[PDB]
RNA sequence: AGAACUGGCGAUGCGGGAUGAACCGAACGUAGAGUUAAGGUGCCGGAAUACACGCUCAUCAGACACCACAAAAGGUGUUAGUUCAUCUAGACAGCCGGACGGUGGCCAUGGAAGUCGGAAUCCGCUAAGGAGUGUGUAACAACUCACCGGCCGAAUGAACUA
RNA sequence: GCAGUCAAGCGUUCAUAGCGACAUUGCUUUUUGAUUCUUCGAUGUCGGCUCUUCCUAUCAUACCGAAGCAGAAUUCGGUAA
């Protein structure tokens, strides 16, 4: 055709109001909202929500989401809070598959010898079914 | 040296714009140096024309504000290559000195200035029958 | 030379007959510790004032915390130093929340890229910039512009073991 | 965790995944390494070249029979290293350069099996943007090596063959997929679910 | 037989130029530090001599 | 001083269609088509339409910068080029041995070969790249000129030509003998 | 080579600086555990491919005092800084518009009208204008500057320092 | 002994093609020196012969650059053992 067909890779990018994980520290598998930026490797988050404290942090123990809010720059915890929830974003992160993979590990080390011997039987009955079904399939 | 320059060209755009009851924001783009010189000798009658930076012709109003309170929304249109023709002889007379005689097409009016009013100068060109149809109409 | 903190050192000469209740004299300091507080401060006043320590007491030392602290701030810092051939003065600029992480920045860059040292080193001010287009350094600038945002490139994955089967990414 | 690790050197940095190998052998891991020529090495090529042929023109002067072998190969360069970073006058030493072997490409049986990575020596990732690299086939090939093109021909015959089980396995999943999916929608399914599996 | 212009262009790629006053280098005569790295990339350069 | 990003604008107007995809550039125009291979380099490219694109580097160093820039004049290089060609002038000279130019091919590999340099008994050969294209003027003397969409077979062939055309031993300045570029301008618009 | 203080080798092992009488550490009954020294923790090698703020790419990189070196002097590699100036009354970069009249200024001659040259560097009206910085015509014609204004709008340059 | 910096000045002019005053910073151990550690119950103590190898601060040969290089010849110089 005519159309330039450009192909920028996309990256999840640091600004205000952006949500994101905590992955280490007290606070390790949290949730906080970056609202301004210190520099290249620091910024500010803020977590009433997740409870964790409003802070200078650093992005290599940060790791960031695809999600993001909007948010005017400066604000305090309790717009924090507000427009956090306004946004309804924990919910969102629990719909994401990777959060849900968070709980399934968390979930699965949770288990007990009993669960396991219990997932065990249930996994050989699903087993004969799919087994025959995918042979006639 | 320079500031005393730009000071100066204050103090003409401020004595033009005190002593004389009108003056012309002309776009000046593309217009010769000989077509100035034709346009002043023909308007060696009454009208004055002043050119120089924008920058230093808003800095001059701006400094102005203190007594002359109006000369405030010329500043909006001082903008692109345009100047002062200030004058004190009639409208249409000094439009058509402007416009149509020793043009070429090309310096425009780009606003015109009046006792604190602002006219884009079509209804000065409007010539007659206006006021026909107005008080016909009525 | 560790994790810095903020302290006010107050001292005077020893009162005497003639001198009962003397000038007392204020520093703001950065140390790890009151210790150090001290110690500098009677650095400080002895290239100043013509007194020792054993000349002088200390009326106080005041630990000392921030306004606003969860507040990122721009400062204007004004800083003297000795160089392998001579000594300089010099003024820099920070964006940090924080006094104390301004200076463990200040320090350690001075570390890097000037190798002066906190022996080598000497604070001549420290002062939040009000006004943004008042800062003069340009890579704080470019944070001030206005609605910024970037990404981080090059996504690099901490492995806590040392295989793994599968090619890594930098997506991010 | 295995009685065998495979692993190629794409992407790689040649001093860091010996270091690495070299602990595991004498701790007691099996290893191969294969794809050897897809090495990687920080700086130019020129300037490797120069460290190749320091190393090349230091031997034994009055024999360069006894005095250092200077080996072309990629591999062996690599297990020139390698046994720089061990004790090979040992019987461990030698016990440990037993238990590994290194080649370049891929034969038959090691590449049936797996290939795995090590991200403590990777080019892309450890290496910071904007600087230089280099690879150990081209600089063993400058340095005198010959093979390099029976190897490239070799490699292209059997990554065609993979890419087919591959397609043929991704095909066959996908299927899977379907015909697991018809009882992920199972009640069975649910309960090992909120087992959390 | 050759005439001036080929003869001021021929100059312009050939005669042209300067020099480096420590690695003789063919540098541009209006350059102001040497291009290579021996030299250290130093600043004392000279124009090229012309002829008779 | 580490600058966080930047980026600069590349004009692609009616008439172009450029394919981009992990720094292979691909770009067609009237002439034909031209592709390129940057994966030296890690910097982004960015669509705003079919007659805008930018080029973006992150939280680059200086060099990285001047390495955008660069970037940016050589993919609009490749534009003008598949657009408008490019052409090279060079003109002969000498002041006694006419400089003896022909072409000849070997297998059709079309080598420009030359003779009587300086009364050289040598013969020259410079072979001709793909793409490109030679043609011997008539309006003026031996004012051979060559064209082309790859600036770089152009301008490198050129040059390949003047350099094999050097005159050893001797003062140049006086032994002008040569060849030597007169002009570049573009295929298209005269 | 020779003297002063002290401490040390010799008489003295051990840990470490690979290696070593003199360094640093610390001084020994034979064993056990523990904590450490100086020193170090990619592998050889016991110990964090620990974290963190950054400097640096070397076609001769660098990498631990004592200890097996390297200097002056230079670098528009690179980093940071100082001081001075230009500039928001609009800078510079860079573009863009005018780049004239008295006037083709005088001599030089087939023709020379700001640009082959010899000799003068004025005046006007200007925001401004050189009796012209060059391109081009046989010569006008046509352009871009000097000089000034439209534009972006905050930056630009000089000298320094380590 | 070797190599450099600065630049008075030569080079008809021309600081720096080639050179370079007054100063000055290093390098090598093929010079002599200085020392006396090793060896005086044993190191065979000039020279040349024949012989292999190494070095480079390169004389020639290869290739290039610069010049007060018109050609020729020549010099300055780099890669180079």
């Known amino acids: 055709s005519t159309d330039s067909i450009v192909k920028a890779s996309n990256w999840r990018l640091v600004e205000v109001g952006r949500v994101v994980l905590i992955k280490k520290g007290q606070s390790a598998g949290k949730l906080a909202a970056i609202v301004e930026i210190i520099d290249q490797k620091k910024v500010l988050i803020d977590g009433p929500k997740a409870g964790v404290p409003r802070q200078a942090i650093n992005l290599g123990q940060v790791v960031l989401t695809p999600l993001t809010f909007a948010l005017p720059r400066g604000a305090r915890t309790a717009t924090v809070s507000k427009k956090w929830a306004a946004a309804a974003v924990c919910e969102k992160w629990a719909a994401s598959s990777w959060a849900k993979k968070i709980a399934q590990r968390e979930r699965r080390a949770a288990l007990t010898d009993f669960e396991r011997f219990q997932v065990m039987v249930l996994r050989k009955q699903k087993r004969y079914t799919v087994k025959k079904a995918l042979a006639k399939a | 040296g320079i500031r005393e320059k730009k000071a100066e060209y204050f103090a003409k755009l401020r004595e033009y714009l005190e002593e004389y009851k009108s003056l012309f924001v002309v776009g000046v783009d593309n217009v010769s140096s000989q077509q100035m010189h034709e346009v002043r000798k023909e308007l060696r009658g009454r009208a004055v024309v002043l050119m120089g930076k924008n920058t230093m012709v808003r800095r001059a109003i701006r400094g102005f504000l203190s007594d002359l309170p109006d000369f405030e929304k010329l500043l909006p249109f001082v903008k692109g290559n345009v100047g002062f023709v200030f004058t004190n002889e009639p409208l249409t007379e000094i439009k058509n000195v402007i416009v149509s005689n020793r043009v070429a097409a090309g310096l425009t009016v780009v606003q015109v200035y009046d006792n604190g009013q602002v006219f884009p100068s079509s209804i000065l060109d409007i010539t007659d029958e206006e006021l026909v149809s107005h008080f016909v109409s009525a | 030379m560790a994790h810095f903190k903020e302290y006010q050192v107050i001292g005077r000469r020893l009162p005497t007959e003639s001198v009962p209740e003397p000038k007392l004299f204020r520093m703001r300091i950065f140390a790890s510790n009151e210790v150090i507080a001290k110690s500098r401060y009677w650095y400080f006043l002895q290239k100043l004032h013509k007194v020792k320590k054993a000349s002088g007491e200390i009326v106080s030392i005041n630990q000392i915390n921030e306004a606003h602290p969860t507040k990122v701030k721009n400062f204007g810092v004004w800083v003297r130093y000795d160089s392998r051939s001579g000594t300089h003065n010099m003024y820099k600029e920070i964006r940090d929340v924080s006094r104390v992480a301004a200076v463990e920045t200040l320090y350690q860059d001075m570390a890097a890229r000037h190798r002066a040292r906190f022996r080598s080193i000497h604070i001549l001010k420290v002062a939040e910039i009000e006004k943004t287009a008042d800062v003069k350094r340009q890579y704080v600038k470019q944070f001030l512009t206005k609605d910024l945002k970037f990404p981080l490139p090059h996504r690099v994955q901490k492995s806590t073991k040392t295989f793994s089967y599968k090619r890594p990414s930098t997506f991010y | ?197 | ?52 | ?190």
């Not at chain 4, 020529?37 to 024999?63: M, P, Q, V």
């Not at chain 4, 072309?72 to 019987?91: D, E, N, Q």
């Not at chain 6, 930047?6 to 692609?12: M, R």
């Not at chain 6, 420009?112 to 003026?140: A, H, Q, W, Y």
Request: glycine letters at 6%.
């Open chain 4, 1 to 197: 965790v295995e009685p065998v690790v495979v692993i190629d050197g794409k992407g790689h940095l040649v001093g860091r995944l010996a270091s690495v190998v070299a602990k595991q052998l004498l701790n007691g891991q099996k290893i191969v390494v294969v794809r050897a020529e897809e090495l990687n090495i920080s700086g130019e090529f020129f300037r490797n070249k120069l460290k190749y042929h320091d190393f090349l023109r230091k031997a034994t002067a009055f024999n360069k029979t006894r005095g250092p072998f200077h080996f072309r190969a990629p591999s062996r360069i690599f297990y020139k290293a390698l046994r720089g970073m061990v004790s090979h006058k040992t019987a461990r030493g030698k016990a440990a350069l037993e238990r590994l072997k290194v080649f370049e490409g891929i034969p038959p049986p090691y590449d049936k099996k797996k290939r795995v990575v090590v991200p403590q020596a990777l080019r892309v990732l450890r290496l910071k943007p904007g600087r230089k690299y280099t690879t150990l086939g081209k600089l063993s090939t400058s340095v005198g090596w010959k093979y390099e093109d029976v190897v490239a021909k070799l490699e292209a015959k059997r990554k065609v063959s993979s890419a087919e089980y591959y397609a043929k396995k991704r095909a066959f999943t996908k299927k899977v997929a379907s015909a697991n999916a018809t009882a992920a929608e199972s009640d069975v399914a649910k309960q090992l679910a909120a087992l959390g599996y």
């Open chain 5, 1 to 52: 037989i050759i005439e001036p212009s080929l003869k001021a262009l021929a100059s312009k790629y050939n005669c042209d130029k300067s020099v480096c006053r420590k690695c003789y280098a063919r540098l541009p005569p209006r350059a102001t530090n040497c291009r290579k790295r021996k030299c250290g990339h130093t600043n004392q350069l000279r124009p090229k001599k012309k002829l008779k």
């Open chain 6, 1 to 190: 001083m580490k600058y966080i990003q930047t980026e600069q604008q590349i004009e692609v107007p009616e008439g172009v269609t450029v394919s981009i995809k992990s720094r292979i550039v691909k770009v067609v125009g009237p002439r034909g088509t031209l592709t390129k291979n940057l994966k030296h380099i890690d910097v982004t490219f960015t669509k705003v339409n079919n007659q805008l694109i930018k080029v973006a580097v992150h939280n680059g160093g200086r060099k990285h910068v001047a390495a955008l820039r660069t970037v940016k004049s050589l993919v609009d290089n490749m534009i003008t080029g598949v657009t408008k060609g490019y052409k090279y002038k060079m003109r002969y000279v000498y002041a006694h041995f006419p400089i003896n130019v022909n072409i000849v091919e070997k297998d059709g590999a079309k080598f420009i070969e030359v003779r009587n340099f300086l009364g050289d008994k040598k013969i020259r050969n410079v072979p001709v790249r793909d793409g490109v294209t030679i043609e011997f003027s008539t309006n003026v003397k031996d004012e051979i000129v060559l064209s082309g969409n790859s600036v770089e077979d152009v301008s490198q062939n050129a040059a390949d030509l003047q350099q094999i055309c050097r005159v050893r031993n001797k003062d140049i300045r006086k032994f002008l003998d040569g060849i030597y570029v007169s002009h570049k301008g573009f295929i298209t618009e005269d």
